[PDB]
């Protein structure tokens, strides 16, 4: 149902859509919900840090609700499950970038664009770090601008074909 990534194991969704992040998934800011349109990108996209974190969080939930019986200590499940949960290629890319003084993703912080005129949001991208800290918003300006263009493009394409028939 909608998603094919790990979430699909038990249909998931949580709400009608957006695979909402609860208040214990986030540090502060209570709840955040995305659109199915953006979350669903993880159905096809393999090499994305945000999507991998979603896969791990959903796994953790499923592994607590279900299969809670093995002495409540199945901490070893992950030793095999990991092959089906994350893209280790991304981890390697981030290690290589670290070695070369190239800003890299440490997986804690993400940014996204929020269309204030609709509530439509992009899939989050990793906020990168370099030399012990986060990069400024002036960096990424090309990437932020491209994500804004991409959101505009999708809105237009949807109306061209589906609004107009």
């Amino acid at each position: 149902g909608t998603f094919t990534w790990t979430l699909s194991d038990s249909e998931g969704n949580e709400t009608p859509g957006g695979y909402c992040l609860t208040r214990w998934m986030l540090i502060e800011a209570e709840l955040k919900c995305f659109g199915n349109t953006a979350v669903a990108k993880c159905n096809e996209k393999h090499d994305e840090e945000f999507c991998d974190m979603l896969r791990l969080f959903d796994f953790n939930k499923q592994a607590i609700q279900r299969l809670k019986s093995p002495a409540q200590m199945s901490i070893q499940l992950i030793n095999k499950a990991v092959n089906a949960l994350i893209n280790d290629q991304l981890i390697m890319k981030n290690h290589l970038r670290d070695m070369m003084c190239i800003p890299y993703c440490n997986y804690s912080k993400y940014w996204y664009l929020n269309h204030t005129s609709s509530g439509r949001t992009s899939l989050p991208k990793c906020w990168l770090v370099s030399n012990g800290s986060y990069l400024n918003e002036t960096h990424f300006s090309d990437d932020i601008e491209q994500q804004a263009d991409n959101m505009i493009t999708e809105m237009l394409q949807k109306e061209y074909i589906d609004r107009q028939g």
Binding site: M25, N60, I75, N83, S117, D149
Partner: protein
């Protein structure tokens, strides 16, 4: 803040502690103290020090297994760490003592008077630090004397790496908890050996 039209840049930061019951989480307190949570109650402490605690070289690994008094999660992590250390044949560098199933492991690194050198690239000290860097990735960067090396010729001021079982006390003041260090090590492990 606002891009193109009305696209506002927004952020989120993840709380990876809620993953502690399924995955081990690494974090850093300061440059000489790094930690791994391996469950809801316990974990490992990794200390970079100038003081040894093990003064012998028996490393009674096979007996720890015959007795089976150790926590299995902790042992799996130690195995992963050790197996991933590239080109480790220099067993005299490692000493451990699982007394009563307690975990205490010490790696004695030849951090020689390398005031100005790039010789200590092919050594044990580098192989052990490489594994360390990955396990505490994201906080391990402050543990080294050097900056953006290739992690294949890195040095620190400390001589010993000591890994011990601890009680989890949320010692994560320098870097936040993350499962990535460990998961990123499990994925590769034993890919650096020499037989020819």
């Amino acid at each position: 803040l606002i891009y193109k039209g009305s696209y506002e840049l927004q952020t989120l930061e993840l709380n990876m502690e809620t993953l502690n019951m399924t995955m081990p989480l690494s974090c850093t307190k300061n440059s000489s103290h790094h930690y791994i949570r391996v469950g809801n109650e316990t974990g490992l402490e990794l200390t970079l020090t100038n003081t040894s605690i093990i003064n012998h070289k028996f490393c009674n690994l096979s007996d720890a297994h015959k007795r089976n008094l150790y926590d299995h999660a902790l042992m799996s992590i130690l195995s992963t760490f050790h197996l991933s250390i590239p080109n480790f044949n220099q067993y005299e560098a490692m000493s451990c003592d699982f007394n009563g199933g307690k975990i205490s492991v010490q790696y004695n690194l030849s951090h020689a008077y390398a005031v100005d050198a790039a010789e200590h690239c092919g050594t044990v000290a580098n192989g052990v630090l490489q594994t360390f860097m990955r396990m505490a990735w994201g906080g391990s960067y402050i543990a080294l004397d050097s900056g953006c090396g290739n992690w294949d010729c890195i040095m620190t001021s400390y001589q010993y790496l000591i890994i011990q079982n601890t009680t989890w006390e949320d010692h994560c003041q320098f870097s936040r908890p993350s499962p990535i260090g460990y998961l990123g090590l499990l994925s590769q492990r034993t890919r650096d050996i020499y037989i020819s």
